[PDB]
Every structure is written in C-alpha cells, then in structure tokens.
C-alpha cells in the first residue's frame, strides 16, 4: 500500500512494543509468548507487576 513500509524479518524480530495484557488481548499475547523470539508473531520478554 502507499501508506506502508515493508519491514524485513531481520528488523521485525528485534523491535518490540510493550503491550499490556488485558482481557481482550490474552488470546493474541499467549500466542506471542509461545512463539518466542525466533518465530515472527511472537515476543521477547514479559514484565511482571
């Protein structure tokens, strides 16, 4: 799309966004912890309370 950038998978598995886990996103953030920092729609670290 014209309003888009194509991110490589080299960049994609490094840059992380802190997403606070709530009732509406635990289905997509459980899958992020399961995939881990190798497989792409995943995560790298979790922050405790």
């Amino acid at each position: 799309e014209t309003n888009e950038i194509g991110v490589p998978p080299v960049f994609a598995v490094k840059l992380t966004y802190p997403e606070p886990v709530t009732a509406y996103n635990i289905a997509e953030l459980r899958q992020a912890v399961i995939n881990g920092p190798d497989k792409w729609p995943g995560a790298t670290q979790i922050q405790n309370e």
């Binding site: 014209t2 888009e4 194509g6 490589p8 998978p9 080299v10 960049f11 994609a12 966004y17």
Partner: protein, 244 residues
C-alpha cells in the same frame, strides 16, 4: 520513517507496517518518493518505532502519509504515480483497449481484493459491457469506472470532473476528443489519464477524490491504480527500441 536531510515535515511521515518475508531491505512504494525526495539508488531511511499509545495515535492521525497529501507551501499535491504507471494509463484508458470478459474480471481482482478491505461493498460489483452482439467486450475506460465504483463509498454519488490531459487532440487523429477528461457520476466517459490526472498534479482525478471523498479514499485510489497499472504492464508490456 525518516529520509535523512529533513528539510520539511513531509520528510518524516508515519507509515503502517507490513512484514515481508525473505527480504533484507526496507521496501517502499513509488508514491512516497516525491515526499521524502528519494531516488532508489542507495538511500538509507531511519525507521523509528514509537512506544506508547499517545504516539501510535499521533502517527496514525497527524503524521501519517494520508494527511500529507497536499504540501503546506502552496497546497500542491506531492503524492502520485511516477514513471511506468503513467505510461500504462495512456494505453489502458486508450480507445483501442478492449478487454474480454475473463480479462475484465481479472484486472479488477488483480488490483482490488475484498479480503484486504479494498472494497466497500464486501462483494465486487461490475458493469455491463459496451459491446453485446458480435462478442461481449469491455473498454479500458470501463475498468477505471469499475475501480472507482468499488473503492468509493456506496452512499455518496459519483465524481463529476472536467479537466485536461497533457496529450493534444491531434496526436490521436481527426475529431478525437481524448484531451478533455470527463467524469460523469463516477464514470470515465472521455479522454485518457496521464501525469495530469493521477500524478502529483493539481485538480486531477486523484486530487478531486481527495476533496470530495477525503484523504483515505484518495489514498486507496493511488494504491488501486498502482496495482492496476502493474498487472496491466505484466500482461501487456512496454518497451523502447531503436525504431522509436
């Protein structure tokens, strides 16, 4: 996303992320090359990734590329198709361009895909052909009518536009009127489309859809015409030889 000499605020715009496999470079559309003033021969761009929702909301609503369509210096549009999409609309919207039925349905779904959210009707609507009896055929101006029929919202009526091309009438022959561009209720009825219409040019069709339907509809038309004149170029090429 940041071209490095940031001489104005459209050199730092807010793009959406599409993660592509198997690539080692950032990868950008041609419509953004005039805004950053980039030439695709080794330019590095900084990719800044903000970290809270007070910044995601402001890269999606204030510094995104769709709101940066007109520059603040004179109000001229700075986003549009560049080199080879210009030289395909002069063939696609030409008057030789007749498409059969199976070719008509392919170019619509080649550029507009309802799964990605390009349609507004959740189902691709089409047009009756312009030739019925010897063989049913569609004209190339009727594809441009179709892709405007799907990306614009169904409630608002079609665009009414009278404009000009860059191509004089006498390059087409006797009594041709293919310089006066005419849109009547969202239907291209006359004249080819050029840099003057879907380039970075003022009072064209893409600059008129920005005024009537807003920045997100005009963003989709540059996306849809960017893919229509890429799949048309693949099926019907373009070359420059020695006899030219």
């Amino acid at each position: 996303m940041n071209r490095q000499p940031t001489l104005h605020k459209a050199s730092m715009m807010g793009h959406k992320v599409r993660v592509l496999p198997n690539e080692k470079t950032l990868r950008l559309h041609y419509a953004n090359t005039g805004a950053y003033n980039a030439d695709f021969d080794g330019d590095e761009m900084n990719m800044h990734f903000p970290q809270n929702e007070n910044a995601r909301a402001e890269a999606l609503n204030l510094a995104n590329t769709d709101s940066q369509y007109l520059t603040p210096t004179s109000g001229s549009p700075v986003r549009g198709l560049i080199q080879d999409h210009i030289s395909a609309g002069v063939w696609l919207t030409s008057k030789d361009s007749f498409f059969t039925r199976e070719q008509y349905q392919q170019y619509i779904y080649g550029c507009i895909r309802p799964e990605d959210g390009h349609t507004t009707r959740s189902k691709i609507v089409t047009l009756p052909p312009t030739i019925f009896k010897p063989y049913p055929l569609w004209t190339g101006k009727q594809i441009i009518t179709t892709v405007l029929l799907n990306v614009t919202p169904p409630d608002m009526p079609g665009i009414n536009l009278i404009s000009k091309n860059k191509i004089k009438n006498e390059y087409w022959g006797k009594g041709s009127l293919e310089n006066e561009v005419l849109f009547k209720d969202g239907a291209l009825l006359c004249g080819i489309l050029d840099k003057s219409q879907y380039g970075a040019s003022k009072y064209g069709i893409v600059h008129s859809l920005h005024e009537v339907y807003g920045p997100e509809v005009a963003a989709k038309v540059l996306s849809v015409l960017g893919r229509l004149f890429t799949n048309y170029i693949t099926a019907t090429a373009f070359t420059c030889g020695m006899d030219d």
